[PDB]
Amino acid sequence: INGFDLPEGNVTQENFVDMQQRCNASDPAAYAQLVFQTCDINAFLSEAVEGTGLAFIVFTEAITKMPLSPLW
Amino acid sequence: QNMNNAGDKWSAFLKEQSTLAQMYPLQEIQNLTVKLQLQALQQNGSSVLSEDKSKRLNTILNTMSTIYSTGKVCNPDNPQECLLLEPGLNEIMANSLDYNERLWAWESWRSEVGKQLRPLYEEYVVLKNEMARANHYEDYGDYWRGDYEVNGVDGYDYSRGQLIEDVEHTFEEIKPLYEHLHAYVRAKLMNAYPSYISPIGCLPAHLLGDMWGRFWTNLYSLTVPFGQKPNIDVTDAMVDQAWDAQRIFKEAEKFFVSVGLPNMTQGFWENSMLTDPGNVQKAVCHPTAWDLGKGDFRILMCTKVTMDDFLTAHHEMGHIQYDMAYAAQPFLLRNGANEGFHEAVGEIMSLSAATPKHLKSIGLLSPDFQEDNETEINFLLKQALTIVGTLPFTYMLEKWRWMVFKGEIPKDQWMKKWWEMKREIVGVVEPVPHDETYCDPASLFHVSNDYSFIRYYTRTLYQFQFQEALCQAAKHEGPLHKCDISNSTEAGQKLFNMLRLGKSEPWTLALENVVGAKNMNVRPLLNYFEPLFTWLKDQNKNSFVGWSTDWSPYADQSIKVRISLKSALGDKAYEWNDNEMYLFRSSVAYAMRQYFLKVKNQMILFGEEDVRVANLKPRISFNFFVTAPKNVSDIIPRTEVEKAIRMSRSRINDAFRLNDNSLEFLGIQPTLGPPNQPP
Amino acid sequence: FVGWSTDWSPYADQSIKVRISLKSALGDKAYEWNDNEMYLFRSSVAYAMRQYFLKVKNQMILFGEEDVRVANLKPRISFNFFVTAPKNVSDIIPRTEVEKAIRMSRSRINDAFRLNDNSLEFLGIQPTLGPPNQPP
Amino acid sequence: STGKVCNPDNPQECLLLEPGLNEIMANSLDYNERLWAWESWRSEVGKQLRPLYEEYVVLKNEMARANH
Ligand SMILES: *[C@@H]1O[C@H](CO)[C@@H](O[C@@H]2O[C@H](CO)[C@@H](O)[C@H](O)[C@H]2NC(C)=O)[C@H](O)[C@H]1NC(C)=O
Ligand SMILES: *[C@@H]1O[C@H](CO)[C@@H](O[C@@H]2O[C@H](CO)[C@@H](O)[C@H](O)[C@H]2NC(C)=O)[C@H](O)[C@H]1NC(C)=O
Ligand SMILES: *[C@@H]1O[C@H](CO)[C@@H](O[C@@H]2O[C@H](CO)[C@@H](O)[C@H](O)[C@H]2NC(C)=O)[C@H](O)[C@H]1NC(C)=O
Ligand SMILES: *[C@@H]1O[C@H](CO)[C@@H](O[C@@H]2O[C@H](CO)[C@@H](O)[C@H](O)[C@H]2NC(C)=O)[C@H](O)[C@H]1NC(C)=O
Ligand SMILES: *[C@@H]1O[C@H](CO)[C@@H](O[C@@H]2O[C@H](CO)[C@@H](O)[C@H](O)[C@H]2NC(C)=O)[C@H](O)[C@H]1NC(C)=O
Ligand SMILES: *[C@@H]1O[C@H](CO)[C@@H](O[C@@H]2O[C@H](CO)[C@@H](O)[C@H](O)[C@H]2NC(C)=O)[C@H](O)[C@H]1NC(C)=O
Ligand SMILES: *[C@@H]1O[C@H](CO)[C@@H](O)[C@H](O)[C@H]1NC(C)=O
Ligand SMILES: *[C@@H]1O[C@H](CO)[C@@H](O)[C@H](O)[C@H]1NC(C)=O
Ligand SMILES: *[C@@H]1O[C@H](CO)[C@@H](O)[C@H](O)[C@H]1NC(C)=O
Ligand SMILES: [Zn+2]
């Protein structure tokens, strides 16, 4: 929505694959310099959870997003 | 008062015979001539409207006409001196080399007249479409194209929608020639205005030689190929042989009797007024040709001894010889075959008389004169600045007006689509962004005074079709631009077979009597300019041919703003109408006032009209730049606006409830904020 | 009555008195009220008149900062103002229509100056709503 | 002597002080037209004569103080 200037309430998770094909059919030159991250679950559910990397990197990152985070 | 009552007896008589003409049906007629006279008289035109809408339309046409002729422009350094369009504002646009004074005259005039003609012009489109749809056209643009319509004459027909394709088909063969002329003028304008013109972009709209860029003919002193060769001028040889007022027409009458055309009518010599009189006599001095009727032809001009009025004498006599030829038709068919033929026959008389071959045989050039190939380029480039330079302007303007009448352009996109068509078709960029409060087409004479403009496109194409067809009959051997039809008889017989038709035949049938084709053609126009097109392609070997529609003369001091309303507030955020754009322009003008007071120690009264917004999108993004309060040529630099916005960013955020991630100034970043507290 | 009063004015019955208490809202950290702040106040009132005539009266009227006429500026920070039609100087918008326009956009004018309805008083216009509760 | 006043309903007709603006102020009984002619004229000429009149007081006081 920043490379083609669309309003924010039109592009969401339900039709992301619908409208990215509409952008290369409209401007094939302006769509080439844009980048699109490739990410899907089972790639974030399988990561480096090595020794001393769960209580210190995984739990302490999730505690800071709860309310009353010094208590947890 | 002697001509207003005698003028209204003619107009009241014609509406009485018009309402008698609908007594006869039109499709129960067989003879083509009596059908053509009946359709030209039965035409309702106005009067199809309600009688209170008919007086509203004439009030708009009178108001738009008096705004254009009585406009005052105020010089921001002395409000006691107002300049009015024809004396003073046309002289700045035609003579000045100051960038800041041409930019002022363009803008001011534009803006003011613009605004006025806006509401009026908007009300004018609705009333003219009602009058055209009651006469069984689809819009008012289809009503204007009814001149070129031809109905049922066995192979010579022409539709009113066929004119649109023939204009666009002929235009894409001029675009190779116009691109090389646009590239040569752009390279010559960079020496006259350095640091103002991009070498791969469009030309700025206020540097073209007049107020609208219609003719490029005032750019000749900056774009002359060889300035050390005088372009040939026979004005001194006229005042060295004591040529009176009468010699200029008597040599003009000998030109036309040389080709096989009749003499002047011998009432032509007493009744006409070839100069302004020996009295200091108030009498509109404007070249014209009159056809009063009853075989009485008079020419009214105030001729001075110059080669300029030696040429327009040949032009104005050409209107007379066209008028003397069709004087045997009935009264309602005594016009040109379409609206474009009448001026085109007048200008092929002027082209043939301006050649140095004709001037040295008419006694005005040393029999020892040498025409070099450097002076033919000087002559052809002066022709192309008037002929070729006006063809994309004429095509773009009628294309915009045709799409406005049929409704392809809604009224919230009139000035958006106007300046997109300038960059794409003409190659001309505006210096200041213009929103939907301006009306820049209506600041031209032909738009605000209700005139059709396609007659200037077709006349240019018919003019070289006539000239190329007459020079094959006169057995010419060289280039087309050296041709002269004097002493021939066979060429005049080719010309006279069209001149006597009038409107009695379809105009496509009139063209085959001269050219040999049934349609207008652009290939004779290009053959005239092939010595220039060969020389132009060698001068543009290191240049770039073409232009970019992205460059602007203001878009390097602009700042892009991006606003994310639904990220900051979400389900509770206001909607961004144009009252929010007014509050944004006042907050930026407030921030510029605080920066110049606390840093530069000056008090400058910035307003919301000094913040110029362009390219408004739905995501909510635009560009803006800041201008000094009444000096439109003074743009505050981008580095001083970034320092002013950094000083007051916390105040602009609070006026809209945004938080520096929902109000982004692209190129300005938040910097500070070191964290700590544990001692 | 022989004599005259120097207090009456032909505009001072459609005027609204504004009182601003900067040091109560912010204290040791409040900006100073120069005439650039008076320019921002006159643009915020002209914005509020534009939004009222568009959403209630369905008209678009181009009010500017030059249509808000300020009189009697004091040090405590108090003045009167009245609103005029954009080029008709004889047409004063009535006081009852400016009170309805300021009530519609009072939360927006407060945020532009960081005031909180006790530091930006329009004398004659009072805050009304706000019923409390939640325990069901 | 050369001030033009524009009628907000027709900007193409400017009235200049002695013919036209003095006749409104001396003959009219319309409240809204007398209020317009007063204000307009005032404001415009006002502004101009301001900076000039301000510079005029300083130079005239210098000439008077040099003549004791
Ligand atoms: C109707 O058409 C006929 C021919 O189609 C016209 O007839 C000519 O008329 C002129 C004088 O009126 C004669 O000199 C010609 O000899 C006629 N031609 C022929 C072939 O007979 C007739 O003029 C047309 N009607 C009108 C009113 O013009
Ligand atoms: C001129 O205007 C008249 C209307 O005043 C048009 O006419 C009518 O024609 C229809 C048939 O199509 C008749 O039923 C009406 O009676 C006519 N008018 C009336 C009511 O008197 C006419 O078509 C117009 N002519 C042109 C140039 O198109
Ligand atoms: C006018 O004609 C002369 C004569 O041919 C041209 O001069 C020639 O130019 C070419 C290209 O630069 C050279 O290769 C020749 O050697 C030149 N001839 C001589 C005799 O020196 C000249 O270029 C022409 N000018 C134009 C504008 O066409
Ligand atoms: C074209 O027409 C002119 C006008 O008649 C001719 O000019 C005459 O030329 C001869 C010799 O060149 C002179 O003796 C006459 O005095 C000229 N006449 C006039 C009126 O000036 C010219 O010769 C014609 N051209 C050709 C090729 O025949
Ligand atoms: C409007 O601004 C322009 C600058 O954008 C001023 O033009 C300058 O004029 C002075 C003297 O007149 C020249 O020395 C400068 O070189 C000019 N600047 C540029 C960039 O050309 C112009 O004077 C301003 N007009 C007013 C009335 O202040
Ligand atoms: C400016 O506003 C005044 C009202 O303050 C308008 O005066 C009214 O004019 C109409 C007709 O001209 C009368 O019927 C009303 O009675 C007038 N009102 C008052 C209070 O006297 C005036 O017309 C406005 N001017 C413009 C150009 O709109
Ligand atoms: C966004 O805009 C497009 C085009 O106007 C529309 O088709 C789509 O439904 C919109 N998305 C919404 C309303 O969520
Ligand atoms: C646009 O890109 C997609 C891949 O992202 C490709 O499949 C498609 O063919 C492209 N369209 C054009 C017109 O090149
Ligand atoms: C035209 O007039 C001249 C004299 O003015 C005369 O000699 C000539 O014969 C005339 N033309 C014709 C065709 O009679
Ligand atoms: Zn002409």
Side-chain angles (χ1 to χ4, degrees):
Chain A
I1 70 152
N2 288 318
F4 291 88
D5 284 304
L6 301 92
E8 295 178 353
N10 306 64
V11 180
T12 190
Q13 309 217 30
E14 282 59 50
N15 42 306
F16 171 67
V17 310
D18 191 342
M19 199 170 334
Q20 57 194 100
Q21 194 47 280
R22 274 180 31 181
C23 294
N24 216 20
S26 315
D27 311 325
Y31 196 71
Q33 71 271 359
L34 281 192
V35 76
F36 288 89
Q37 281 289 325
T38 80
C39 56
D40 184 275
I41 313 170
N42 306 83
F44 292 120
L45 275 177
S46 158
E47 282 197 56
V49 185
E50 81 285 339
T52 57
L54 208 170
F56 299 144
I57 301 185
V58 172
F59 261 93
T60 60
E61 193 196 325
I63 287 168
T64 65
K65 303 179 186 306
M66 268 86 86
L68 265 170
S69 63
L71 188 63
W72 305 109
Chain B
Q1 202 50 250
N2 197 13
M3 74 104 74
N4 281 128
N5 47 9
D8 199 281
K9 288 186 289 294
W10 164 243
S11 162
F13 161 76
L14 199 138
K15 81 181 295 182
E16 185 155 61
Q17 307 283 337
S18 83
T19 188
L20 289 204
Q22 289 93 18
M23 224 33 86
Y24 311 99
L26 187 57
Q27 66 93 29
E28 326 185 321
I29 318 294
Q30 306 304 125
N31 216 336
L32 284 163
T33 295
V34 76
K35 193 162 94 167
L36 271 178
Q37 305 177 55
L38 257 182
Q39 195 269 329
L41 201 51
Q42 197 181 358
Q43 204 77 16
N44 258 320
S46 61
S47 64
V48 265
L49 295 165
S50 179
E51 203 271 326
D52 56 351
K53 282 199 276 194
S54 178
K55 312 173 92 73
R56 184 51 184 155
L57 182 52
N58 293 126
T59 306
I60 294 162
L61 292 180
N62 278 49
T63 303
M64 283 198 306
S65 180
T66 187
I67 285 168
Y68 181 82
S69 23
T70 59
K72 299 297 221 162
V73 165
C74 274
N75 153 21
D77 262 309
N78 191 0
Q80 265 71 52
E81 63 180 33
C82 272
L83 283 179
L84 195 209
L85 188 45
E86 191 273 330
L89 220 58
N90 275 128
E91 198 264 358
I92 289 172
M93 297 308 291
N95 287 128
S96 190
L97 299 154
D98 187 14
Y99 188 93
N100 303 133
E101 202 188 31
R102 295 182 68 93
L103 178 40
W104 168 78
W106 194 82
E107 235 297 285
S108 83
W109 163 258
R110 221 148 234 80
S111 94
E112 348 251 290
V113 160
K115 328 273 147 133
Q116 325 221 218
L117 311 164
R118 183 75 196 216
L120 294 159
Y121 198 76
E122 262 170 27
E123 211 184 341
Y124 158 85
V125 172
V126 185
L127 284 173
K128 283 284 183 176
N129 271 335
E130 283 184 10
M131 185 261 289
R133 280 193 283 267
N135 298 11
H136 308 136
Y137 298 92
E138 64 265 18
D139 55 337
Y140 196 57
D142 198 55
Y143 180 86
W144 268 344
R145 300 192 298 269
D147 191 336
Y148 298 88
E149 193 204 78
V150 164
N151 284 324
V153 288
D154 299 333
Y156 297 94
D157 293 20
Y158 210 81
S159 178
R160 304 191 302 258
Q162 196 169 357
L163 186 72
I164 314 182
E165 288 97 14
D166 286 359
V167 171
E168 306 186 310
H169 171 76
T170 45
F171 181 65
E172 49 205 20
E173 316 186 41
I174 327 172
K175 294 163 57 157
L177 170 64
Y178 176 67
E179 271 174 58
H180 282 269
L181 181 74
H182 181 275
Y184 172 79
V185 168
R186 180 176 63 199
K188 283 308 196 85
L189 269 185
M190 288 177 65
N191 305 332
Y193 308 96
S195 161
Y196 283 124
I197 290 167
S198 177
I200 51 157
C202 298
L203 302 164
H206 68 295
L207 305 176
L208 288 178
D210 62 326
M211 189 49 93
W212 312 270
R214 179 179 176 196
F215 306 105
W216 291 4
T217 182
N218 280 137
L219 295 187
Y220 180 65
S221 74
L222 317 165
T223 52
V224 54
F226 313 99
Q228 65 276 8
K229 294 283 195 316
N231 208 0
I232 60 164
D233 184 313
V234 279
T235 302
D236 55 351
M238 324 191 51
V239 297
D240 288 20
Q241 297 181 359
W243 283 0
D244 59 347
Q246 302 304 106
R247 194 72 186 271
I248 299 172
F249 282 93
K250 256 299 175 184
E251 303 285 341
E253 198 191 19
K254 209 187 79 183
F255 173 75
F256 281 102
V257 77
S258 163
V259 81
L261 286 179
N263 269 330
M264 296 280 112
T265 187
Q266 170 79 33
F268 179 76
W269 296 109
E270 309 103 343
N271 296 114
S272 177
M273 194 189 89
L274 296 185
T275 61
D276 38 357
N279 178 228
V280 45
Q281 182 67 264
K282 184 60 70 177
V284 278
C285 241
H286 174 13
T288 335
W290 287 66
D291 195 338
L292 312 175
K294 309 271 223 74
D296 184 25
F297 313 102
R298 306 181 187 182
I299 277 180
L300 171 67
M301 69 172 316
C302 255
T303 187
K304 324 290 151 173
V305 184
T306 314
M307 92 162 298
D308 204 304
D309 287 332
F310 167 72
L311 285 178
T312 199
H314 282 65
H315 170 78
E316 283 296 290
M317 196 166 282
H319 290 142
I320 285 300
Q321 297 268 1
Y322 193 30
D323 274 332
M324 294 172 59
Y326 55 70
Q329 313 282 331
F331 174 68
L332 283 178
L333 308 181
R334 287 168 179 171
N335 290 340
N338 53 63
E339 60 181 5
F341 275 178
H342 204 86
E343 272 296 311
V345 68
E347 289 178 340
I348 70 178
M349 313 313 190
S350 178
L351 258 61
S352 180
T355 65
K357 174 195 270 222
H358 176 72
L359 289 172
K360 69 177 73 174
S361 70
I362 193 65
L364 266 118
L365 269 206
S366 262
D368 62 14
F369 194 75
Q370 295 297 108
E371 292 88 4
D372 47 335
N373 56 340
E374 283 204 330
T375 320
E376 306 273 6
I377 299 297
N378 287 283
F379 169 68
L380 273 178
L381 193 132
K382 204 176 184 170
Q383 289 276 83
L385 289 176
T386 316
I387 295 293
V388 190
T390 199
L391 284 181
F393 180 82
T394 313
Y395 162 67
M396 188 274 323
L397 191 145
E398 274 289 88
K399 193 184 173 180
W400 181 89
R401 271 212 292 194
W402 284 342
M403 293 161 71
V404 160
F405 288 145
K406 64 183 73 171
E408 297 184 357
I409 307 176
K411 67 175 71 175
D412 56 349
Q413 284 180 110
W414 277 9
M415 291 300 303
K416 175 174 173 289
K417 275 292 298 171
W418 168 259
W419 282 111
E420 290 178 354
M421 291 163 74
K422 294 294 285 290
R423 299 160 173 250
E424 183 216 350
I425 299 176
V426 192
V428 160
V429 66
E430 77 264 45
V432 157
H434 285 337
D435 57 322
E436 299 294 324
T437 47
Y438 292 85
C439 190
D440 291 0
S443 52
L444 194 39
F445 171 73
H446 302 259
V447 185
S448 61
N449 282 84
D450 201 18
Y451 287 120
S452 179
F453 212 65
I454 206 54
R455 59 153 64 90
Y456 298 107
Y457 185 84
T458 63
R459 190 252 320 164
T460 307
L461 260 62
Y462 296 147
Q463 168 190 344
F464 297 98
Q465 278 179 268
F466 287 159
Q467 180 82 352
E468 202 189 58
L470 288 183
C471 291
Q472 307 210 48
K475 278 79 176 174
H476 194 54
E477 71 274 15
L480 190 56
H481 76 278
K482 294 179 170 183
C483 183
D484 188 18
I485 59 149
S486 284
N487 274 307
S488 158
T489 309
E490 198 40 68
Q493 195 58 46
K494 283 206 61 62
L495 192 54
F496 188 61
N497 208 11
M498 180 262 295
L499 261 51
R500 75 172 180 188
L501 292 182
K503 288 177 72 69
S504 87
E505 310 267 39
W507 66 268
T508 52
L509 179 58
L511 261 178
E512 60 89 24
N513 292 123
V514 176
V515 181
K518 297 180 179 67
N519 40 38
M520 63 167 180
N521 194 33
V522 79
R523 288 298 320 168
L525 187 136
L526 304 167
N527 287 165
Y528 190 90
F529 289 108
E530 290 297 325
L532 185 68
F533 191 40
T534 296
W535 182 83
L536 275 178
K537 287 190 297 184
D538 194 77
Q539 297 289 308
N540 300 149
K541 292 190 289 185
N542 312 129
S543 296
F544 174 68
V545 173
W547 54 86
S548 174
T549 70
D550 293 332
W551 180 84
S552 295
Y554 52 87
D556 61 334
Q557 317 285 275
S558 293
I559 301 176
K560 185 171 185 179
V561 182
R562 202 188 285 136
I563 297 170
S564 297
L565 277 177
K566 273 75 180 172
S567 176
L569 335 156
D571 34 32
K572 197 188 302 330
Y574 47 88
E575 62 96 18
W576 189 272
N577 44 5
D578 52 319
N579 293 344
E580 304 285 339
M581 287 298 306
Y582 167 71
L583 191 60
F584 190 85
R585 290 194 319 264
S586 314
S587 309
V588 173
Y590 159 78
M592 300 294 302
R593 281 189 188 206
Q594 296 276 73
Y595 180 74
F596 276 84
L597 181 69
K598 307 188 188 284
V599 185
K600 306 292 186 177
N601 297 113
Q602 311 177 6
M603 62 93 72
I604 307 180
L605 300 192
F606 291 102
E608 58 92 11
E609 62 268 356
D610 304 305
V611 187
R612 320 268 185 166
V613 172
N615 302 128
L616 185 50
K617 300 269 166 59
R619 158 146 194 42
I620 303 201
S621 27
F622 46 90
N623 296 71
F624 79 101
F625 63 98
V626 193
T627 291
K630 288 186 288 293
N631 198 2
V632 78
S633 299
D634 198 352
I635 303 181
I636 312 295
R638 196 202 210 263
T639 62
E640 299 294 325
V641 179
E642 287 167 340
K643 289 164 179 49
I645 283 177
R646 280 177 190 273
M647 212 191 94
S648 295
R649 191 161 184 174
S650 177
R651 206 75 186 275
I652 299 167
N653 286 343
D654 294 359
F656 296 95
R657 298 167 180 154
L658 305 172
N659 52 87
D660 267 19
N661 307 308
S662 297
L663 182 46
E664 292 181 352
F665 295 91
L666 270 75
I668 309 175
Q669 286 108 349
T671 65
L672 314 180
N676 176 242
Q677 101 71 184
Chain C
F1 174 68
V2 173
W4 54 86
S5 174
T6 70
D7 293 332
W8 180 84
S9 295
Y11 52 87
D13 61 334
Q14 317 285 275
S15 293
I16 301 176
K17 185 171 185 179
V18 182
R19 202 188 285 136
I20 297 170
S21 297
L22 277 177
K23 273 75 180 172
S24 176
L26 335 156
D28 34 32
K29 197 188 302 330
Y31 47 88
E32 62 96 18
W33 189 272
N34 44 5
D35 52 319
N36 293 344
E37 304 285 339
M38 287 298 306
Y39 167 71
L40 191 60
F41 190 85
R42 290 194 319 264
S43 314
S44 309
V45 173
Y47 159 78
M49 300 294 302
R50 281 189 188 206
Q51 296 276 73
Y52 180 74
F53 276 84
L54 181 69
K55 307 188 188 284
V56 185
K57 306 292 186 177
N58 297 113
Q59 311 177 6
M60 62 93 72
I61 307 180
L62 300 192
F63 291 102
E65 58 92 11
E66 62 268 356
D67 304 305
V68 187
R69 320 268 185 166
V70 172
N72 302 128
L73 185 50
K74 300 269 166 59
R76 158 146 194 42
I77 303 201
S78 27
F79 46 90
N80 296 71
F81 79 101
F82 63 98
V83 193
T84 291
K87 288 186 288 293
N88 198 2
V89 78
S90 299
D91 198 352
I92 303 181
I93 312 295
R95 196 202 210 263
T96 62
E97 299 294 325
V98 179
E99 287 167 340
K100 289 164 179 49
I102 283 177
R103 280 177 190 273
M104 212 191 94
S105 295
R106 191 161 184 174
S107 177
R108 206 75 186 275
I109 299 167
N110 286 343
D111 294 359
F113 296 95
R114 298 167 180 154
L115 305 172
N116 52 87
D117 267 19
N118 307 308
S119 297
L120 182 46
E121 292 181 352
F122 295 91
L123 270 75
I125 309 175
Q126 286 108 349
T128 65
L129 314 180
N133 176 242
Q134 101 71 184
Chain D
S1 23
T2 59
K4 299 297 221 162
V5 165
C6 274
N7 153 21
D9 262 309
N10 191 0
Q12 265 71 52
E13 63 180 33
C14 272
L15 283 179
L16 195 209
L17 188 45
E18 191 273 330
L21 220 58
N22 275 128
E23 198 264 358
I24 289 172
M25 297 308 291
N27 287 128
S28 190
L29 299 154
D30 187 14
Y31 188 93
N32 303 133
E33 202 188 31
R34 295 182 68 93
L35 178 40
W36 168 78
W38 194 82
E39 235 297 285
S40 83
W41 163 258
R42 221 148 234 80
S43 94
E44 348 251 290
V45 160
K47 328 273 147 133
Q48 325 221 218
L49 311 164
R50 183 75 196 216
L52 294 159
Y53 198 76
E54 262 170 27
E55 211 184 341
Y56 158 85
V57 172
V58 185
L59 284 173
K60 283 284 183 176
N61 271 335
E62 283 184 10
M63 185 261 289
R65 280 193 283 267
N67 298 11
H68 308 136

